[PDB]
mmCIF file of all heavy atoms in Angstrom:
data_model
loop_
_atom_site.group_PDB
_atom_site.id
_atom_site.type_symbol
_atom_site.label_atom_id
_atom_site.label_comp_id
_atom_site.label_asym_id
_atom_site.label_seq_id
_atom_site.Cartn_x
_atom_site.Cartn_y
_atom_site.Cartn_z
ATOM 1 N N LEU F 87 -4.457 211.190 89.071
ATOM 2 C CA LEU F 87 -3.858 209.992 88.493
ATOM 3 C C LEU F 87 -3.198 210.205 87.047
ATOM 4 O O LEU F 87 -3.639 209.787 86.038
ATOM 5 C CB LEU F 87 -4.762 208.771 88.533
ATOM 6 C CG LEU F 87 -6.009 208.760 87.614
ATOM 7 C CD1 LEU F 87 -5.918 207.568 86.571
ATOM 8 C CD2 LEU F 87 -7.359 208.516 88.356
ATOM 9 N N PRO F 88 -2.018 210.949 87.036
ATOM 10 C CA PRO F 88 -1.421 211.486 85.805
ATOM 11 C C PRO F 88 -0.710 210.284 84.929
ATOM 12 O O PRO F 88 -0.254 210.616 83.854
ATOM 13 C CB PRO F 88 -0.381 212.556 86.186
ATOM 14 C CG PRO F 88 0.021 212.062 87.619
ATOM 15 C CD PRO F 88 -1.203 211.243 88.209
ATOM 16 N N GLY F 89 -0.719 209.102 85.459
ATOM 17 C CA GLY F 89 -0.032 207.911 84.915
ATOM 18 C C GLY F 89 0.766 207.067 85.982
ATOM 19 O O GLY F 89 1.247 206.036 85.717
ATOM 20 N N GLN F 90 0.926 207.687 87.211
ATOM 21 C CA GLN F 90 1.733 207.125 88.350
ATOM 22 C C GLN F 90 0.794 206.999 89.574
ATOM 23 O O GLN F 90 0.912 206.004 90.313
ATOM 24 C CB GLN F 90 2.922 208.021 88.632
ATOM 25 C CG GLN F 90 3.485 207.919 90.045
ATOM 26 C CD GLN F 90 4.725 208.781 90.234
ATOM 27 O OE1 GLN F 90 4.661 209.960 90.670
ATOM 28 N NE2 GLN F 90 5.861 208.246 89.925
ATOM 29 N N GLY F 91 -0.081 207.880 89.908
ATOM 30 C CA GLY F 91 -1.052 207.907 90.957
ATOM 31 C C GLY F 91 -1.140 209.187 91.644
ATOM 32 O O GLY F 91 -1.851 210.032 91.146
ATOM 33 N N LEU F 92 -0.404 209.426 92.778
ATOM 34 C CA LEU F 92 -0.461 210.617 93.512
ATOM 35 C C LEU F 92 0.933 211.005 94.058
ATOM 36 O O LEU F 92 1.461 210.322 94.977
ATOM 37 C CB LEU F 92 -1.545 210.426 94.640
ATOM 38 C CG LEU F 92 -2.490 211.661 94.818
ATOM 39 C CD1 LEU F 92 -3.885 211.276 94.509
ATOM 40 C CD2 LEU F 92 -2.341 212.310 96.131
ATOM 41 N N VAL F 93 1.459 212.049 93.576
ATOM 42 C CA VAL F 93 2.692 212.630 94.110
ATOM 43 C C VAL F 93 2.530 213.385 95.440
ATOM 44 O O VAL F 93 1.555 214.169 95.525
ATOM 45 C CB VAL F 93 3.428 213.559 93.127
ATOM 46 C CG1 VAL F 93 4.658 214.251 93.549
ATOM 47 C CG2 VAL F 93 3.635 212.886 91.723
ATOM 48 N N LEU F 94 3.411 213.172 96.430
ATOM 49 C CA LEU F 94 3.408 213.821 97.619
ATOM 50 C C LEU F 94 4.541 214.970 97.628
ATOM 51 O O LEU F 94 5.476 214.790 96.879
ATOM 52 C CB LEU F 94 3.610 212.874 98.779
ATOM 53 C CG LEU F 94 2.332 212.406 99.521
ATOM 54 C CD1 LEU F 94 1.568 213.437 100.207
ATOM 55 C CD2 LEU F 94 1.320 211.699 98.454
ATOM 56 N N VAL F 122 -3.435 200.822 101.119
ATOM 57 C CA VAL F 122 -2.209 201.558 100.902
ATOM 58 C C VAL F 122 -1.089 201.034 101.886
ATOM 59 O O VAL F 122 -1.448 200.906 103.044
ATOM 60 C CB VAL F 122 -2.488 203.051 101.037
ATOM 61 C CG1 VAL F 122 -1.303 203.832 101.518
ATOM 62 C CG2 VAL F 122 -2.830 203.609 99.659
ATOM 63 N N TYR F 123 0.031 200.748 101.377
ATOM 64 C CA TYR F 123 1.220 200.348 102.138
ATOM 65 C C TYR F 123 2.564 200.792 101.558
ATOM 66 O O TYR F 123 2.723 200.690 100.292
ATOM 67 C CB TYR F 123 1.184 198.764 102.152
ATOM 68 C CG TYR F 123 0.247 198.135 103.097
ATOM 69 C CD1 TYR F 123 -0.796 197.236 102.626
ATOM 70 C CD2 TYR F 123 0.488 198.218 104.495
ATOM 71 C CE1 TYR F 123 -1.513 196.458 103.535
ATOM 72 C CE2 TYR F 123 -0.278 197.364 105.403
ATOM 73 C CZ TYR F 123 -1.250 196.515 104.961
ATOM 74 O OH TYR F 123 -1.899 195.721 105.840
ATOM 75 N N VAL F 125 6.224 200.555 100.439
ATOM 76 C CA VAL F 125 7.123 199.584 99.839
ATOM 77 C C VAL F 125 8.020 200.173 98.714
ATOM 78 O O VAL F 125 7.645 201.148 98.182
ATOM 79 C CB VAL F 125 6.332 198.379 99.309
ATOM 80 C CG1 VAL F 125 5.463 197.605 100.265
ATOM 81 C CG2 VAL F 125 5.384 198.820 98.162
ATOM 82 N N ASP F 126 9.157 199.533 98.461
ATOM 83 C CA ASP F 126 10.138 199.999 97.477
ATOM 84 C C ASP F 126 9.458 199.908 96.019
ATOM 85 O O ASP F 126 8.522 199.285 95.747
ATOM 86 C CB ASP F 126 11.334 199.166 97.496
ATOM 87 C CG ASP F 126 11.945 199.036 98.913
ATOM 88 O OD1 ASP F 126 12.757 199.973 99.260
ATOM 89 O OD2 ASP F 126 11.688 198.044 99.685
ATOM 90 N N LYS F 127 10.168 200.638 94.991
ATOM 91 C CA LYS F 127 9.866 200.541 93.598
ATOM 92 C C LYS F 127 9.842 199.100 93.139
ATOM 93 O O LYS F 127 9.062 198.767 92.161
ATOM 94 C CB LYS F 127 10.796 201.377 92.761
ATOM 95 C CG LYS F 127 12.231 200.765 92.500
ATOM 96 C CD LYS F 127 13.162 201.560 91.629
ATOM 97 C CE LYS F 127 14.291 200.638 91.161
ATOM 98 N NZ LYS F 127 15.628 201.324 91.097
ATOM 99 N N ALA F 130 6.429 197.903 93.763
ATOM 100 C CA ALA F 130 5.707 198.535 92.651
ATOM 101 C C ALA F 130 5.806 197.923 91.297
ATOM 102 O O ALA F 130 4.824 197.949 90.469
ATOM 103 C CB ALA F 130 6.042 200.037 92.613
ATOM 104 N N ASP F 131 6.976 197.232 91.042
ATOM 105 C CA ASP F 131 7.199 196.473 89.840
ATOM 106 C C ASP F 131 6.432 195.163 89.720
ATOM 107 O O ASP F 131 5.846 194.778 88.653
ATOM 108 C CB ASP F 131 8.713 196.320 89.549
ATOM 109 C CG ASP F 131 9.104 196.363 88.199
ATOM 110 O OD1 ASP F 131 8.989 197.405 87.474
ATOM 111 O OD2 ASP F 131 9.687 195.329 87.607
ATOM 112 N N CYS F 133 3.694 194.555 91.658
ATOM 113 C CA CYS F 133 2.368 194.848 92.068
ATOM 114 C C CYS F 133 1.845 194.080 93.398
ATOM 115 O O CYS F 133 0.796 193.632 93.455
ATOM 116 C CB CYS F 133 1.386 194.696 90.895
ATOM 117 S SG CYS F 133 0.268 196.181 90.785
ATOM 118 N N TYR F 176 10.741 208.046 99.195
ATOM 119 C CA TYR F 176 9.771 207.124 99.737
ATOM 120 C C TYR F 176 8.829 206.723 98.599
ATOM 121 O O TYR F 176 8.323 207.663 97.778
ATOM 122 C CB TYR F 176 8.977 207.715 100.993
ATOM 123 C CG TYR F 176 9.568 207.482 102.328
ATOM 124 C CD1 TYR F 176 10.807 208.189 102.653
ATOM 125 C CD2 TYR F 176 8.984 206.630 103.140
ATOM 126 C CE1 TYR F 176 11.343 207.967 103.831
ATOM 127 C CE2 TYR F 176 9.566 206.358 104.478
ATOM 128 C CZ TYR F 176 10.733 207.061 104.878
ATOM 129 O OH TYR F 176 11.295 206.929 106.056
ATOM 130 N N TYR F 177 8.534 205.446 98.553
ATOM 131 C CA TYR F 177 7.485 204.795 97.604
ATOM 132 C C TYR F 177 6.439 204.086 98.477
ATOM 133 O O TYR F 177 6.706 203.576 99.555
ATOM 134 C CB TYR F 177 8.120 203.920 96.658
ATOM 135 C CG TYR F 177 8.498 204.428 95.264
ATOM 136 C CD1 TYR F 177 9.298 205.662 95.143
ATOM 137 C CD2 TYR F 177 8.016 203.823 94.093
ATOM 138 C CE1 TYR F 177 9.611 206.144 93.822
ATOM 139 C CE2 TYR F 177 8.313 204.382 92.837
ATOM 140 C CZ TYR F 177 9.148 205.548 92.749
ATOM 141 O OH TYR F 177 9.417 205.980 91.504
ATOM 142 N N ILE F 178 5.189 204.047 98.019
ATOM 143 C CA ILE F 178 4.038 203.435 98.525
ATOM 144 C C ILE F 178 3.163 202.972 97.381
ATOM 145 O O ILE F 178 3.061 203.651 96.408
ATOM 146 C CB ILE F 178 3.230 204.479 99.435
ATOM 147 C CG1 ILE F 178 4.059 205.182 100.515
ATOM 148 C CG2 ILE F 178 1.949 203.914 100.062
ATOM 149 C CD1 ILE F 178 3.424 206.023 101.609
ATOM 150 N N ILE F 179 2.509 201.881 97.588
ATOM 151 C CA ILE F 179 1.672 201.224 96.570
ATOM 152 C C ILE F 179 0.332 200.820 97.137
ATOM 153 O O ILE F 179 0.251 200.610 98.361
ATOM 154 C CB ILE F 179 2.311 200.177 95.693
ATOM 155 C CG1 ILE F 179 2.229 198.723 96.173
ATOM 156 C CG2 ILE F 179 3.836 200.570 95.310
ATOM 157 C CD1 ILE F 179 2.909 197.653 95.380
ATOM 158 N N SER F 180 -0.674 200.516 96.354
ATOM 159 C CA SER F 180 -1.934 199.993 96.695
ATOM 160 C C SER F 180 -2.585 198.992 95.686
ATOM 161 O O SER F 180 -2.093 199.071 94.497
ATOM 162 C CB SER F 180 -2.958 201.090 96.951
ATOM 163 O OG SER F 180 -4.023 200.597 97.756
ATOM 164 N N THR F 181 -3.526 198.323 96.055
ATOM 165 C CA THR F 181 -4.102 197.172 95.293
ATOM 166 C C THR F 181 -5.627 197.316 95.088
ATOM 167 O O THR F 181 -6.387 196.421 95.159
ATOM 168 C CB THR F 181 -3.811 195.799 96.038
ATOM 169 O OG1 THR F 181 -4.285 195.787 97.309
ATOM 170 C CG2 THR F 181 -2.214 195.593 96.103
ATOM 171 N N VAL F 196 -3.878 197.155 90.027
ATOM 172 C CA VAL F 196 -4.073 198.621 89.787
ATOM 173 C C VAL F 196 -2.760 199.320 89.680
ATOM 174 O O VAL F 196 -2.662 200.208 88.761
ATOM 175 C CB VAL F 196 -4.859 199.142 91.070
ATOM 176 C CG1 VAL F 196 -4.283 200.455 91.637
ATOM 177 C CG2 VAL F 196 -6.306 199.501 90.645
ATOM 178 N N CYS F 197 -1.729 199.062 90.383
ATOM 179 C CA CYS F 197 -0.407 199.647 90.268
ATOM 180 C C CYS F 197 0.181 199.391 88.754
ATOM 181 O O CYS F 197 0.988 200.197 88.279
ATOM 182 C CB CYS F 197 0.595 199.088 91.365
ATOM 183 S SG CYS F 197 1.582 197.655 90.840
ATOM 184 N N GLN F 198 -0.354 198.289 88.143
ATOM 185 C CA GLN F 198 0.013 197.905 86.740
ATOM 186 C C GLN F 198 -0.714 198.630 85.707
ATOM 187 O O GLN F 198 -0.169 198.716 84.552
ATOM 188 C CB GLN F 198 -0.286 196.334 86.623
ATOM 189 C CG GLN F 198 0.858 195.623 85.850
ATOM 190 C CD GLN F 198 0.326 194.314 85.237
ATOM 191 O OE1 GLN F 198 -0.259 193.494 85.939
ATOM 192 N NE2 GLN F 198 0.534 194.150 84.048
ATOM 193 N N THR F 199 -1.842 199.306 85.992
ATOM 194 C CA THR F 199 -2.719 199.987 84.969
ATOM 195 C C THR F 199 -3.344 201.286 85.415
ATOM 196 O O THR F 199 -2.965 202.352 84.857
ATOM 197 C CB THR F 199 -3.902 199.021 84.568
ATOM 198 O OG1 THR F 199 -3.436 197.877 84.012
ATOM 199 C CG2 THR F 199 -4.840 199.664 83.603
ATOM 200 N N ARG F 200 -4.192 201.363 86.470
ATOM 201 C CA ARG F 200 -4.581 202.694 87.129
ATOM 202 C C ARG F 200 -3.355 203.527 87.535
ATOM 203 O O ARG F 200 -3.450 204.743 87.632
ATOM 204 C CB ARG F 200 -5.372 202.378 88.374
ATOM 205 C CG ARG F 200 -6.880 202.363 88.261
ATOM 206 C CD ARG F 200 -7.489 201.241 87.474
ATOM 207 N NE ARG F 200 -8.689 200.537 88.116
ATOM 208 C CZ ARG F 200 -9.841 201.080 88.410
ATOM 209 N NH1 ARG F 200 -10.173 202.259 87.961
ATOM 210 N NH2 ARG F 200 -10.726 200.444 89.060
ATOM 211 N N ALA F 201 -2.257 202.838 87.939
ATOM 212 C CA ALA F 201 -1.130 203.280 88.684
ATOM 213 C C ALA F 201 -1.590 203.986 89.985
ATOM 214 O O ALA F 201 -1.934 205.173 90.073
ATOM 215 C CB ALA F 201 -0.231 204.234 87.782
ATOM 216 N N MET F 202 -1.713 203.185 91.086
ATOM 217 C CA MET F 202 -1.914 203.662 92.401
ATOM 218 C C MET F 202 -0.728 203.438 93.268
ATOM 219 O O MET F 202 -0.622 202.589 94.170
ATOM 220 C CB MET F 202 -3.177 203.076 93.086
ATOM 221 C CG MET F 202 -3.518 203.842 94.344
ATOM 222 S SD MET F 202 -5.235 203.368 94.825
ATOM 223 C CE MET F 202 -5.704 204.887 95.788
ATOM 224 N N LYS F 203 0.419 204.270 93.013
ATOM 225 C CA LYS F 203 1.560 204.485 93.850
ATOM 226 C C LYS F 203 1.793 205.960 94.170
ATOM 227 O O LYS F 203 1.223 206.849 93.531
ATOM 228 C CB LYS F 203 2.742 203.785 93.243
ATOM 229 C CG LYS F 203 3.365 204.296 91.980
ATOM 230 C CD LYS F 203 3.133 203.515 90.701
ATOM 231 C CE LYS F 203 3.902 204.119 89.528
ATOM 232 N NZ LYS F 203 4.583 202.984 88.618
ATOM 233 N N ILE F 204 2.612 206.209 95.175
ATOM 234 C CA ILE F 204 3.037 207.509 95.546
ATOM 235 C C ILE F 204 4.590 207.606 95.475
ATOM 236 O O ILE F 204 5.234 206.650 95.578
ATOM 237 C CB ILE F 204 2.471 208.004 96.989
ATOM 238 C CG1 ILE F 204 3.415 207.755 98.216
ATOM 239 C CG2 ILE F 204 1.134 207.312 97.223
ATOM 240 C CD1 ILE F 204 4.183 208.875 98.624
ATOM 241 N N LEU F 205 5.099 208.877 95.192
ATOM 242 C CA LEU F 205 6.457 209.219 95.210
ATOM 243 C C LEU F 205 6.647 210.481 96.038
ATOM 244 O O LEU F 205 5.890 211.348 95.953
ATOM 245 C CB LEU F 205 6.981 209.270 93.724
ATOM 246 C CG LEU F 205 7.836 210.374 93.307
ATOM 247 C CD1 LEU F 205 9.286 210.298 93.803
ATOM 248 C CD2 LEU F 205 7.978 210.493 91.737
#
Side-chain angles (χ1 to χ4, degrees):
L87 74 114
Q90 158 177 95
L92 224 122
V93 178
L94 267 294
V122 149
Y123 281 118
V125 295
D126 307 277
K127 79 179 195 214
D131 212 64
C133 228
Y176 273 71
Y177 264 57
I178 305 194
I179 89 180
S180 196
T181 59
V196 133
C197 93
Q198 225 203 306
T199 299
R200 265 69 134 66
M202 196 168 204
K203 70 249 187 142
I204 95 96
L205 139 72

